[PDB]
């Protein structure tokens, strides 16, 4: 039987992980892509440095057309080559907006990013704070730092938001996905989540729960691994960022697996690409909510958060008379909330 | 009574200099700017590093909307954000023209600039030469620097034009404006002018008094502090430079004040901003004449000279769905001519 | 007169508003006259340049004597503030056994082994103590260490992974008393305990110090003890790059303000002898052992924080050039906080 859900593709990739990684830079699951378009045939996306004809390729590097795993499940094999706009919304999010909400710029003493969303703690005092990344919100040298908006007191005027309380660095793949997606013993998944509660003296009347440029949003869309592939992969999503305004894109790959220079395996949740030849995100967009758009009038639903700028890692080069495109990685929102024990307002 | 002259604005700025200086990057006087459009309400413009809502500013950090001066004069406050064209005219001014005049390129041993205008010495033996900025006209090590056009012989073919006779860099505010512009003694306005006379063997038949791309010009328009603000602020000007060609802009503020790292106050006379989101000038345009646009068919008249490119200092970022716009600083022509004792030439 | 370090600390804290205007740092100890240590207790003040009093306005002229809330008075000392050998080769990885001062290389940086220790509670695992700057990389909280080089850079063996570490501690908890009018007061602990791997061979670990010998128990620093017990005492250290070196303790409870206004505290200040540098780069984490007196076994007193070549040097004004200084963290308080006992 052909693969239908993400779990089958993940199992197939894990079973033949060695062969896929033997002559490749990365692996993921999704739909087969032909001539730059997304089809409806489930398959495994294999990233290579360059694309060449089979004539100049030895049989060792000739990847099999079909990969078959336990239980009779089989899938196709796809080899893919791998290598501040001034607007009213951007100005408002940069310090021109009276209220504070999603997409607002949050600057630390050293780095800056985009405000993720307003959340509340499930247990304890149930303090209301905001959720963001961990590479910008908190510097590793100082575990507990402060938050300033728009800028700290040394760079310019600003107000104090709060201090970092709970943050996550890495999580074992078993805890995150619930299944073993890799044979290497030290498999990790990046969360890059942190919660900063609002200060006691901070006014709460200036906090808004409406996302600028999108409008009202629904409940968090939990990505169930048993759901059909077409449910999540290929759906058009939108994002709001301080330096990128409002952007739209489409998701192509999920659970991208790669290895660093030290051989440690790492996983990325969501892989998306901007639409109409436009880059999905830019520098300073760390902390932008990826939201699945409205369908049949239903309220848009956040599904994840952008990890950060991918321009420093690589680009997706298309082989159909087109230049390389910019891909953006993502981090799951439901699993991050579950780990952080937070509820989105 | 609402102030309507530059003198009142200068008095208000000087009387409350400390308050503005405490949390400002610069001060000027002119017309209030709302949503990127100049208004008719006179106000003192205060320049800040960034613009934020008043809710995230301390009570001492909030500049008052209005201020009062001696005798009952009151004025508003406007906070403003602060942070080679290949053409036939440019080619001709580069050294391919049949005559040398305003806008021509003058190159020293090290740097280059644009000829200001042909002038005549009021006193002495009625020497005839030209006016330009002091920075490029004279080398800091050689008080008497030679002039070449279009390039010095060490860098390319050219002819000798003359030698620097007199130059001025800084002058006390009392002598320049006639009034005390601040509560600082060590206050000096930057004239940055030099008079370079033509060589005895140089041919005067090749000197023309007609500005290329504009036409004939009239007498220098002296700026009076008692005149209405609308006379100078908000008017349209045009300039010709050897690098940017012909460029049109608008005057936005007067008597800009700046503080250096050492704490020495400095003053700039004319503040210009380009039109249609186009830079007023670029590097190498220093010394280009600023000419007020003709009105009701009147002959255009120069109002000042251009100090140089501002790209090495900063830009003002408009907060209306647009990016930073380049601005230019200039020095009053009439006061510089009076100090240097020079007379402009407008006819052959 | 101030006889204990606590009196000097209280005096400095009470008047910590006039010495911070025109000073780069403050500490306590003995007044220095003509380049030599005196016996008069005083508070050391660090200035960029030691100009003459005549060319100094009265506002910038600091008082020479201060009085505390209990009648204690102390003077003011103003000091201007700005190898290939067999032992080194053996310590670099040529020794059959590991021990104090041994080179330990991580995936990014390398450092010196502080001392072999054990945990008081729990499994009481046996490991070693070092600095977090080298042993711990925060973009990889659990890092691996190899001696003398990591596999990617050369031959080596697996030692273990960092389990517990401390970077900053509140001043009240560390010293026990409020040392500053500032609440964002922090003290740089910089101590990480790495336990030996289960498969690691424990027969190759020695508690003897190369170039020094056997050492006794850790000598805890008591703020109530006379300054002579700690200030002006000779100390020695063994570093991977600097071999065996000796120096003298100069200052205690040094305070420094960063560019962001956050104050930080360093415990021990040491200076090399004979105009020789106390330590070089890569010697961070080396133990500081008090010189043996009257035949008593040497007792370590702290751990070197790191090289000061990137932080400045002590400039003297007696026909001599600047002398490099070294910063250290008290061993007793760090061990108490981290619950570790030196074997
Ligand atoms: N290791 C490799 N190095 C270089 N080129 C390779 C390597 N492995 C495969 N290729 C080339 O990449 C091709 C992958 O084809 P794939 O199945 O991904 O695409 P397709 O659906 O046939 O069409 P399209 O080219 O439009 O994507 C292989 O046929 C071979 O030409
Ligand atoms: N020191 C300061 N730093 C930053 N922002 C400031 C400072 N002082 C005032 N502001 C902000 O700048 C605003 C000044 O507005 P301005 O004087 O330009 O009036 P306006 O013409 O009504 O405004 P606009 O140009 O936005 O149409 C103040 O209302 C406050 O929001
Ligand atoms: N803020 C300052 N900046 C520069 N120099 C200063 C400052 N305050 C004091 N001084 C100078 O430093 C001297 C401090 O001398 P100090 O306290 O070390 O006495 P001393 O031990 O007798 O002197 P010495 O070390 O020269 O033998 C003051 O007498 C004055 O000359």
Automatic annotation (TrEMBL), chain A:
Q: Which UniProt keywords apply?
A: ATP-binding, Nucleotide-binding
**Can you cite an annotated GO cellular component?**
cytoplasm
The portions of this protein that span the membrane are none
Q: What GO biological process terms are annotated to this protein in UniProt?
A: internode patterning; leaf vascular tissue pattern formation; regulation of leaf development; stem vascular tissue pattern formation
UniProt: ATP 1 binding residues? 32, 34-35, 51, 79
Q: Which residues form the Nal1 C-terminal domain?
A: 84-345
Binding-site positions, ATP 2: 32, 34-35, 61, 79
Describe the location of the Nal1 N-terminal domain by residue ranges. Answer: 1-80
Binding residue positions for ATP 4:
35, 51, 61, 79
Residues that hold ATP 3 according to the record: 32, 35, 79
Q: Which domain of life is it from?
A: Eukaryota
- What name does UniProt use for this protein? Uncharacterized protein
Span within the parent record: 89 to 444 of 588
Automatic annotation (TrEMBL), chain C:
The Nal1 N-terminal domain covers 1-79
Q: Locate the Nal1 C-terminal domain: which residues?
A: 83-343
What are its GO cellular component terms? cytoplasm; nucleoplasm
Positions contributing to ATP 2 binding: 31, 33-34, 60, 78
Binding-site residues for ATP 1, renumbered to this chain? 31, 33-34, 50, 78
Kindly state a single biological-process term from the GO annotations of this entry.
internode patterning
The entry marks the following residues as binding ATP 4, namely 34, 50, 60, 78
In this chain, ATP 3 is annotated as bound at 31, 34, 78
Keywords in alphabetical order, please. ATP-binding, Nucleotide-binding
Q: What protein name is recorded for this chain? A: Uncharacterized protein
